[PDB]
Amino acid sequence: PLVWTQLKQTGTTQPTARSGHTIITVGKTHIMFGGLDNDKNNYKDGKIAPNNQVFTLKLTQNNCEWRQIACQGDVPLPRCYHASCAISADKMLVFGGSYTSNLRFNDTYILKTTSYQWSKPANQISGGEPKNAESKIGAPQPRYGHSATFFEGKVYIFGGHGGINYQRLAFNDLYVLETENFEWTRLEPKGNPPDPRGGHSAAMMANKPQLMIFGGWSFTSQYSNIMIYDIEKDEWVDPEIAHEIPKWNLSGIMAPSIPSWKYFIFGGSVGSFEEGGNRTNSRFVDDSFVLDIDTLSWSSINLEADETSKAVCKPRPRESASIFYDSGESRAIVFGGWANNWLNDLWALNVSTITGPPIFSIKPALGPLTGKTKVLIEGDGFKDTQNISVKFSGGKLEKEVNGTFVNEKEISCETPTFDYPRSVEVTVCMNK
Amino acid sequence: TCLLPVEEPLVKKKIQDMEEEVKPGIEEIRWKSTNIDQFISKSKSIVDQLFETVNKMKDSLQKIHKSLANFNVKIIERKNRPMSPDDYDQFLKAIFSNKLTIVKDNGNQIQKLVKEVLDAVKADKKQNSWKNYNDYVNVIVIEGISTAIQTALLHLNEQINPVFIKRNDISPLFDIRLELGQSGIQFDPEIGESSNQLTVRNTIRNWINDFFNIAGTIQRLDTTMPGDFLQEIRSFFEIKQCLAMITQNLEWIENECNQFRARFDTYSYLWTEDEQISFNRFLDNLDLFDEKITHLKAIQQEIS
């Protein structure tokens, strides 16, 4: 079943409510470090600044324990609204932070998960300090609330809301840097670019070169359209699919499903205004939409079970928030974000749609009740030899059949006899 | 030495040219031959130009700060004795429109003041120094907006929070109407978030939005013609603490309020639920009927 539940955080210490916090998943562990804590336990005397503390995430049987590592080779400076991406399974690097609003960092720091050590890459960031204007070595201009997308061998940032020196403006350009030597190179494709936006979340779609960026915030207006850019041919292709209501400061976490990859966007602020003027009003949405890449359409998701409440129950939208999805438990967890008052609440909802892959088609798809024949079921992620099972009938009855993997993409079964010729389905069971 | 730290970096050339201009003048000094009248004309004109420009930059920043302080005011004004929930929105709406217009008027003057600095500074917008300074003016306006919105929220908290109200003689402010409901006792306000029709939380929620709404009037500082200010104000830790405190106070009255409403609900709510045809069940004889009737008369007096 799919529903929104709250997991109580327990441990020696508990992370304070934060807005500019980035949570990503690398290998089998989750590492999240965020600043802008409401409590003034850092810096003090006004001008509240971010806390450079990284806490690992472990969740078992709806129980979460938070552990923070205070030992590192060197400590990176505080980051606010910083995009975070992970290279391979041992190289997570976070770039794009802001110190006391006016200062924006264009420097990049890499943290190795195994040794818990932060390091500067080559001569790209020889000196690290908070400077209002930085325009040397790194091609990207210092910016905050940008989007970082990771592809094999490359890192791409298309986020705006950053400006060289005092001037601040939305960014209409995307910068890609190879992580092999940490070289930073600006990439300008031929296709017409989308309007510059800030506080937008972009992720790779279905393990393909095309990456979709949806919902951005800009000074002129708020844009809520989907743009997908593929490294091959360079020019991005516009699907033209757009969200019903304009959405900004929205976080999206990619989910892997064998039939179609699913993208979920929860939180953020939607405000519809005409050109200039107004724009003061801000509405937070707790409902999270679901998008299928093959379909390329946004479909609203509702809770099947109210758990006897008799009404839908959901957590506060919290505007911008950090959401990480665990493939093993097939659940998406969001730590929340500032929504007027910072709230330290963690809510994780299991995705019923993201059914485990362990069918494409079957042949034959018709058969006689009297006769006995064995059919072929083809699809993805099928188990090999033992521990493989399938369903039979389903037309007001429950059945299981003997089966055997022909290959990891094909299963043979014999059709059971059926009393009545009505409607028959065929499904898969992984026992658990 | 009186020039602002942000000002010198933004336009180093104007200050540096004066220093280069006066550098020869100090070397020139010798009471043996004085050409100070011409020296004075060139030096006073460059110094006055340098001085007047510095004053205009200082005057602009000072004007921006003064406008923000006056605009916050009081977010909510209490008109003596209690009226009604809808009535407070009605009386408050007229006050909110005037306050919103005044904030926009102050914002227009601050925006115009920013244009004057560029004319006085005579520095291209493309140059980074002006861009860094431009963001700084916007940050001060953001900081001022956060303080102004925080004060209005704080004023509501003193009225909204019960402990401050109990100590004071102000006592009641809002008005609640109670009408008996077959399903349960029901208040005109209905004491709950509800998310439908009209409720005190829904109204208070609307009131909180008005402070957030002041974001539109500022319309950013520079670079983006259309910009929002709610995302920045919401991010401030201080604004979140004030908003969080208001929610806690609302929850406290609802709890104790439910207990007060529960006492009536223990007997009155149970009675409305029961059907009249329940009288036969109470009976099971003529003597029993007489005793039940006497008890019923006693119950009528007790209920009155």
* SS3 assignment for B78-139: CCCCCCCHHHHHHHHHHHHHHHHHHHHHHHHHHHHHHHHHHHHHCCCCCCHHHHHHHHHHHH
Closest CA relative to residue A163, chosen from B89, B136, B88: B136
| β-strand partners of A58 | A65
According to DSSP H, which parts of A270-313 are helical? none
Token digits of residue B69: 């302080």
Counting one residue from chain A and one from chain B, the pairs whose CB atoms sit within 8 A come to 150
Distance CA B229, CA B149 (A): 12
Q: How far is CA B73 from CA B103, B110, B147, B154, B159, in A?
A: 10, 17, 11, 12, 16
Q: H or E stretch including A65?
A: strand A63-68
Q: How far is CA A69 from CA A32, A95, A114, in A?
A: 11, 20, 12
Q: Does B235 contact A36 at a Cβ distance shorter than 8 Å? A: yes
Sign of CA dihedral B233, B234, B238, B239: positive
Q: Which residues contact A428 (CB under 8 A, 6 or more apart)?
A: A358, A359, A389, A390, A391
Q: Does B222 contact A340 at a Cβ distance shorter than 8 Å? A: no
Sheet of A201-204: strands edge to edge? A201-204, A211-217, A222-229
Closest CA relative to residue A160, chosen from A102, A212, A83, A230: A83
Cβ of B108: how many Cβ atoms within 10 Å?
12
Token digits of residue B263: 């006492």
Q: Does B215 contact A279 at a Cβ distance shorter than 8 Å? A: yes
Distance CA B246, CA B192 (A): 14
Interface test with A, best of B157, B196, B240 (most A CBs within 10 A): B240
Location of structure tokens 């094909």: A410
Q: What is the DSSP string of A175-215?
A: EEEETTT--EEE---SSPPPPP-BS-EEEESTTSS-EEEEE
Whether chain B has a CB inside 8 Å of the CB on A275: the answer is: yes
Measure in Å the smallest separation between the Cα of B236 and chain A Cα atoms: 8
Whether chain A has a CB inside 8 Å of the CB on B227: the answer is: yes
Contact (CB, 8 A) for A92 and A117: no
Distance CA B232, CA A277 (A): 17
Around A331, how many Cα atoms within 13 Å sit in the side-chain half-sphere?
A: 19
Whether chain B has a CB inside 8 Å of the CB on A88: the answer is: no
Measure in Å the smallest separation between the Cα of B231 and chain A Cα atoms: 8
Question: Helices (H) and strands (E) in chain B — how many of each?
Answer: 12, 2
Distance CA B118, CA A212 (A): 40
Token digits of residue B2: 């009186």
Query: Which residue among A102, A165, A282 places its CB closest to the CB of B230?
Result: A282
The SS3 assignment for B179 reads strand
Cβ of A278: how many Cβ atoms within 10 Å?
17
Which residues 172-201 of A are in CB contact (within 8 Å) with B?
Answer: 199
Q: What is the DSSP string of A344-382?
A: ---EEEE-SSS------EEE-----SSS--EEEEE-SS-
Distance CA A13, CA A55 (A): 10
The SS3 assignment for B30 reads coil
The SS3 assignment for A278 reads coil
Please provide the distance, in angstroms rounded to a whole number, between the alpha carbons at the two ends of chain B: 83
Gaps in chain B (C to N distance exceeding 2.5 A) after = 284
Cβ of A175: how many Cβ atoms within 10 Å?
21
Structural biology method used: cryo-EM
Sheet of A289-292: strands edge to edge? A251-255, A262-266, A289-292, A297-299
Contact (CB, 8 A) for A30 and A17: no
Token digits of residue B259: 């207990």
Q: Phi and psi for B149 in degrees, rounded to 5?
A: -65, -40
Whether chain B has a CB inside 8 Å of the CB on A219: the answer is: yes
Query: Which residue among A167, A219, A342 places its CB closest to the CB of B226?
Result: A219
- B-chain CB neighbours of A216 within 8 Å are none
The SS3 assignment for A171 reads coil
Residues B222, B228, B231: CA angle, nearest 5 degrees: 120
Q: How far is CA B86 from CA A23, B90, B93, B158, in A?
A: 44, 6, 10, 21
Measure in Å the smallest separation between the Cα of B17 and chain A Cα atoms: 22
Residue B236's Cα: distance from chain center in Å? 13
Query: Which residue among A48, A168, A282 places its CB closest to the CB of B237?
Result: A48
Whether chain A has a CB inside 8 Å of the CB on B242: the answer is: yes
Residue of B nearest to A163 (CA): B131
Interface test with A, best of B10, B221, B228 (most A CBs within 10 A): B228
Inter-axis angle of helices B128-160 and B200-218, nearest 10: 160
Closest CA relative to residue B211, chosen from B136, B157, B135: B157
Which residues 124-153 of B are in CB contact (within 8 Å) with A?
Answer: 125, 127-136, 138-139, 142
Measure in Å the smallest separation between the Cα of A324 and chain B Cα atoms: 21
Query: Which residue among A17, A37, A338 places its CB closest to the CB of B235?
Result: A338
Report the C-alpha dihedral over residues A334, A338, A344, A348, rounded to 10 degrees: -10
Amino acid of residue A162:
G
Contact (CB, 8 A) for A341 and A332: no
Contact (CB, 8 A) for B131 and A167: yes
Distance CA B207, CA B191 (A): 16
Location of structure tokens 């809002």: B174
Q: Does A248 contact B213 at a Cβ distance shorter than 8 Å? A: no
| Exposed e or buried b per residue across B234-265, where buried means at least 16 C-beta atoms within 10 angstroms of its C-beta | bbbbbbbbbbbbbbebbeeeeeeeeeebeeee
Residue A382's Cα: distance from chain center in Å? 26
Report the C-alpha dihedral over residues A104, A88, A337, A279, rounded to 10 degrees: 60
Token digits of residue A317: 């939208």
Closest CA relative to residue A62, chosen from A373, A329, A263: A329
Q: Does A170 contact B224 at a Cβ distance shorter than 8 Å? A: yes
Distance CA A425, CA B270 (A): 51
Interface test with B, best of A282, A309, A314 (most B CBs within 10 A): A282
Contact (CB, 8 A) for B25 and B45: no
Contact (CB, 8 A) for A161 and A199: yes
| Exposed e or buried b per residue across A289-307, where buried means at least 16 C-beta atoms within 10 angstroms of its C-beta | bbbbbeeeebeebebeeee
Distance CA A303, CA A300 (A): 10
Whether chain A has a CB inside 8 Å of the CB on B79: the answer is: no
Token digits of residue B227: 């910009």
Q: Specify the resolution in Å.
A: 30.3
| β-strand partners of A21 | A34
Q: Does B220 contact A248 at a Cβ distance shorter than 8 Å? A: no
| β-strand partners of A178 | A154
Closest CA relative to residue A296, chosen from A261, A253, A322: A261
Distance CA B43, CA B23 (A): 11
Phi-psi region of A336 (alpha: psi -120 to 50; beta: other; left: phi over 0): left
Token digits of residue A193: 């670019």
Contact (CB, 8 A) for A270 and A248: yes
Radius of gyration of chain B from its Cα atoms, rounded to whole angstroms: 34
Distance CA A64, CA A347 (A): 11
Interface test with A, best of B230, B243, B248 (most A CBs within 10 A): B230
Q: Does A168 contact B247 at a Cβ distance shorter than 8 Å? A: no
Query: Which residue among A132, A168, A280 places its CB closest to the CB of B230?
Result: A280
Distance CA A7, CA A10 (A): 9
- B-chain CB neighbours of A170 within 8 Å are 223-224
Sign of CA dihedral B220, B222, B226, B231: negative
Query: Which residue among A19, A48, A276 places its CB closest to the CB of B225?
Result: A276
| β-strand partners of A168 | none
Q: Does B240 contact A342 at a Cβ distance shorter than 8 Å? A: yes
Residue A312's Cα: distance from chain center in Å? 24
Amino acid of residue B2:
C
Residues A360, A242, A323: CA angle, nearest 5 degrees: 75
Cis peptide preceding A364, ω within 30 of 0? yes
Residues A273, A21, B233: CA angle, nearest 5 degrees: 40
Whether chain A has a CB inside 8 Å of the CB on B183: the answer is: no
Please provide the distance, in angstroms rounded to a whole number, between the alpha carbons at the two ends of chain A: 14
Long-range CB contacts for residues A293-301, cutoff 8 Å, separation at least 24: A293/A205, A293/A206, A293/A260, A293/A261, A293/A262, A293/A263, A294/A206, A294/A259, A294/A260, A294/A261, A295/A260, A296/A226, A296/A239, A296/A241, A297/A241, A298/A241, A298/A243, A298/A244, A301/A2, A301/A264, A301/A353
Closest CA relative to residue A241, chosen from A227, A222, A254: A227
Q: Which residues contact B164 (CB under 8 A, 6 or more apart)?
A: B158
Three-state SS string over A86-114 comes to EECCCEEEEEEEEECCCEEEEEEEEEECC
Whether chain A has a CB inside 8 Å of the CB on B243: the answer is: yes
The SS3 assignment for B292 reads helix
Phi-psi region of A5 (alpha: psi -120 to 50; beta: other; left: phi over 0): beta
- B-chain CB neighbours of A20 within 8 Å are 235
Closest CA relative to residue A164, chosen from A196, A145, A139, A128: A139
Interface test with A, best of B104, B211, B235 (most A CBs within 10 A): B235
- A-chain CB neighbours of B134 within 8 Å are 166-168
Whether chain B has a CB inside 8 Å of the CB on A40: the answer is: yes
Contact (CB, 8 A) for B116 and B60: yes
Token digits of residue A58: 């472990």
Inter-axis angle of helices B85-121 and B36-72, nearest 10: 170
Amino acid of residue A62:
N
Residue of B nearest to A103 (CA): B132
Distance CA A431, CA B255 (A): 46
Which residues 351-410 of A are in CB contact (within 8 Å) with B?
Answer: none
